[PDB]
Amino acid sequence: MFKAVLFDLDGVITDTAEYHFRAWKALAEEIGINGVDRQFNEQLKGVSREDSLQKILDLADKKVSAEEFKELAKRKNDNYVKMIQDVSPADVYPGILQLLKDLRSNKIKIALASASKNGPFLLERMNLTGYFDAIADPAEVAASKPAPDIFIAAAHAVGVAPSESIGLEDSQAGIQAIKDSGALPIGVGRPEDLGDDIVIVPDTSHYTLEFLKEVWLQKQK
Amino acid sequence: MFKAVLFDLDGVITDTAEYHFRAWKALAEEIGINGVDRQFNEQLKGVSREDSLQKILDLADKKVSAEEFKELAKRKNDNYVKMIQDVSPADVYPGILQLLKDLRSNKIKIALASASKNGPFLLERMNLTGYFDAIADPAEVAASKPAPDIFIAAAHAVGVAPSESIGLEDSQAGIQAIKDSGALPIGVGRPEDLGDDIVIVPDTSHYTLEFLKEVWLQKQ
Ligand SMILES: O=P(O)(O)OC[C@H]1O[C@H](O)[C@H](O)[C@@H](O)[C@@H]1O
Ligand SMILES: O=P(O)(O)OC[C@H]1O[C@H](O)[C@H](O)[C@@H](O)[C@@H]1O
Ligand SMILES: [Mg+2]
Ligand SMILES: [Mg+2]
Ligand SMILES: [Mg+2]
Ligand SMILES: [Mg+2]
């Protein structure tokens, strides 16, 4: 049986992938870059703050000083943080709270593997901090998803090897990071977007301890 | 949220489907019928006593007098009743007791929809009688499963509409009966036998209050 579950936050626990998209959209248009639409946002999901800006910059081949780069990243975050002030326990996606309770009840470790530095604020505002045995600190992990670093760190932070872990993700980059880490990905979204080679659920209500066990087992074979 | 759970008994609450199968198998061979194997028994699960006997006879194209037909049904039952004298709380399938507690804790009606006239005796030997708000009396409904009559009666006996009820069943006929009642079936057994069109769990430990809730919420 798997010994840990590594949670993405934005788009898995709550509807904050939407707000990241809005805020990034707003930053691009401000600096004159027009192609950050929903289809392009699929490449930004799971991607770290600085790396997300660089994708946006590359879209227009725009080049900026190191100082302006830092300033744009701060401006997007100041905006995003203003967007997420209403988040509360009411915004926790379906299945998630029960899943955390069941994981804690069955002594399965729970770790956050969110690239977001706003992760801890959101878990507290959603009154979920108590469920998390560990949070991987994006300030500590060298490389943004699709690099596995964050999922490796989360597994280790709860004393578990990635091969004994499930990762829950809504993004292409995060799913690749799970695979490359050795953990077992279970995606939430459209198969069109996240790939029909892995187990994809239409929404988080499908994420249940028993569903995770079925997946796991079927994997073992 | 669903307002009642209509329990089958044999093969759901306890392992008595096996006892019925043994008994029917031993009776068939006595009148010379050798083909009552596990695969054929899937056609007997959920079926009333007299109908199960008629199926066994039809398997061999055998005809008997009305007197012998009664006599054979009584013979099987006398043997079945002997077999079940040892049943106790130790024989309740896993998960079943906790489920009943959680349903009664959540004020969800619990009704028996067992075609077995031995149903109340088994509930008492398993010390489960207290949990049941009502028991549908199979003597009062003529039509055996797969007809929905028994499940209709069980739901009505606890004041709940079948469409607001979940039925738990181990048999092909009962799952058909639940379906035609309008209730939501969740089977326990092999999907090969009960159909991969409905939610099927491998054993009763999967029957938990929250699983019933997730399944029901997953409506349409
Ligand atoms: O800007 P931060 O709050 O540190 O978030 C950095 C990244 O983490 C999240 O998990 C999202 O999937 C990304 O859209 C976001 O850019
Ligand atoms: O003979 P009875 O105890 O009246 O049982 C009548 C029927 O009820 C049970 O639920 C079983 O599924 C059937 O195998 C049995 O034939
Ligand atoms: Mg995400
Ligand atoms: Mg300068
Ligand atoms: Mg049965
Ligand atoms: Mg009572």
Side-chain angles (χ1 to χ4, degrees):
Chain A
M1 181 52 48
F2 62 88
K3 289 283 108 74
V5 184
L6 316 174
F7 285 77
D8 182 54
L9 197 163
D10 306 311
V12 174
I13 299 179
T14 193
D15 195 28
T16 37
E18 167 68 20
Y19 292 131
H20 284 298
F21 171 39
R22 282 186 212 186
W24 284 127
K25 188 185 192 57
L27 196 283
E29 293 168 353
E30 216 186 273
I31 65 164
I33 295 163
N34 266 60
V36 181
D37 55 19
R38 201 161 288 274
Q39 175 173 26
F40 182 84
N41 190 246
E42 287 297 311
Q43 308 190 38
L44 302 181
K45 286 174 178 193
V47 176
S48 81
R49 197 181 304 165
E50 289 73 11
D51 295 28
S52 284
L53 173 60
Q54 189 65 59
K55 281 176 187 299
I56 290 171
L57 296 179
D58 290 352
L59 199 58
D61 214 39
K62 180 185 181 62
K63 298 272 195 279
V64 306
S65 69
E67 295 85 345
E68 184 181 335
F69 188 90
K70 295 178 191 156
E71 185 196 327
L72 291 165
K74 169 182 193 315
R75 198 200 309 315
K76 177 268 173 178
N77 184 61
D78 294 340
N79 191 28
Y80 171 69
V81 166
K82 269 122 228 69
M83 282 180 178
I84 63 167
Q85 289 303 134
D86 293 332
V87 171
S88 80
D91 304 281
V92 177
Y93 271 157
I96 299 297
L97 185 60
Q98 194 55 60
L99 178 65
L100 296 165
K101 291 178 173 154
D102 287 1
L103 287 171
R104 185 162 72 177
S105 278
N106 285 264
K107 312 294 191 220
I108 297 158
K109 299 298 209 168
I110 301 158
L112 193 76
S114 176
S116 168
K117 297 184 183 167
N118 289 290
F121 169 73
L122 286 173
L123 291 175
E124 182 53 52
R125 293 288 276 167
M126 283 178 300
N127 203 9
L128 300 176
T129 305
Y131 294 99
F132 284 76
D133 296 302
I135 297 166
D137 192 337
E140 300 186 298
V141 295
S144 171
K145 310 170 176 178
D149 296 33
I150 192 65
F151 284 97
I152 294 164
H156 291 180
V158 294
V160 180
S163 62
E164 303 317 304
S165 307
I166 286 167
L168 308 184
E169 254 291 345
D170 70 310
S171 72
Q172 300 175 344
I175 282 164
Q176 182 62 53
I178 296 166
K179 287 174 176 186
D180 295 341
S181 80
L184 172 52
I186 306 168
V188 56
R190 318 191 302 151
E192 302 87 82
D193 296 323
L194 305 179
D196 69 345
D197 60 310
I198 67 162
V199 173
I200 300 312
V201 298
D203 62 61
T204 55
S205 72
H206 289 255
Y207 281 153
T208 69
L209 174 57
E210 280 306 330
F211 187 75
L212 267 53
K213 281 170 168 190
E214 278 153 51
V215 169
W216 178 256
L217 292 188
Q218 215 88 11
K219 182 103 213 208
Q220 307 318 304
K221 254 176 143 199
Chain B
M1 187 58 60
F2 66 91
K3 289 171 189 138
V5 181
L6 315 174
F7 281 78
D8 179 53
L9 199 168
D10 307 310
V12 168
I13 296 178
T14 188
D15 193 22
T16 39
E18 177 71 25
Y19 292 36
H20 281 299
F21 172 36
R22 282 190 206 184
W24 273 126
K25 188 170 182 40
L27 188 280
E29 292 168 353
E30 279 188 301
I31 57 167
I33 295 169
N34 266 342
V36 176
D37 56 18
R38 283 218 175 270
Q39 179 183 340
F40 179 82
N41 190 60
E42 290 294 312
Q43 305 188 39
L44 304 181
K45 285 173 186 193
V47 178
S48 81
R49 198 181 300 160
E50 286 73 11
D51 290 24
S52 290
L53 170 60
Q54 188 62 57
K55 279 184 188 300
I56 290 171
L57 297 184
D58 290 357
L59 180 65
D61 211 282
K62 174 183 276 300
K63 291 70 180 316
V64 311
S65 65
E67 296 85 348
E68 189 177 338
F69 178 98
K70 286 177 187 151
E71 274 152 22
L72 287 165
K74 179 182 203 320
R75 195 181 177 70
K76 179 271 175 179
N77 185 63
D78 294 340
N79 186 21
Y80 177 71
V81 167
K82 220 176 175 209
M83 286 179 181
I84 61 173
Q85 289 301 303
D86 296 328
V87 172
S88 80
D91 297 285
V92 179
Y93 267 154
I96 300 294
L97 187 59
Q98 195 60 65
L99 173 68
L100 295 163
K101 291 176 169 154
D102 287 2
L103 288 167
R104 174 210 230 151
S105 276
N106 282 267
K107 306 153 172 177
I108 295 155
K109 298 299 210 172
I110 297 159
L112 194 71
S114 173
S116 168
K117 289 178 175 161
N118 292 296
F121 174 75
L122 289 176
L123 289 181
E124 180 54 56
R125 295 296 280 161
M126 284 178 302
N127 201 7
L128 297 177
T129 308
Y131 295 103
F132 284 77
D133 293 301
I135 296 163
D137 191 337
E140 300 287 289
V141 327
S144 169
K145 307 172 174 179
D149 303 39
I150 187 59
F151 284 101
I152 293 162
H156 175 74
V158 290
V160 180
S163 55
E164 303 182 278
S165 304
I166 284 169
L168 305 185
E169 254 291 344
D170 71 309
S171 72
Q172 298 175 347
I175 283 156
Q176 186 65 54
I178 296 168
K179 279 173 172 184
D180 293 344
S181 81
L184 166 53
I186 306 165
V188 57
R190 313 189 305 154
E192 298 151 13
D193 300 324
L194 304 179
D196 68 345
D197 62 312
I198 61 161
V199 172
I200 298 310
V201 296
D203 66 67
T204 53
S205 74
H206 293 261
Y207 281 155
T208 67
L209 175 58
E210 288 306 327
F211 186 69
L212 263 53
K213 279 171 163 190
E214 164 207 337
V215 177
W216 182 90
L217 300 156
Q218 215 60 231
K219 26 225 309 104
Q220 51 132 33

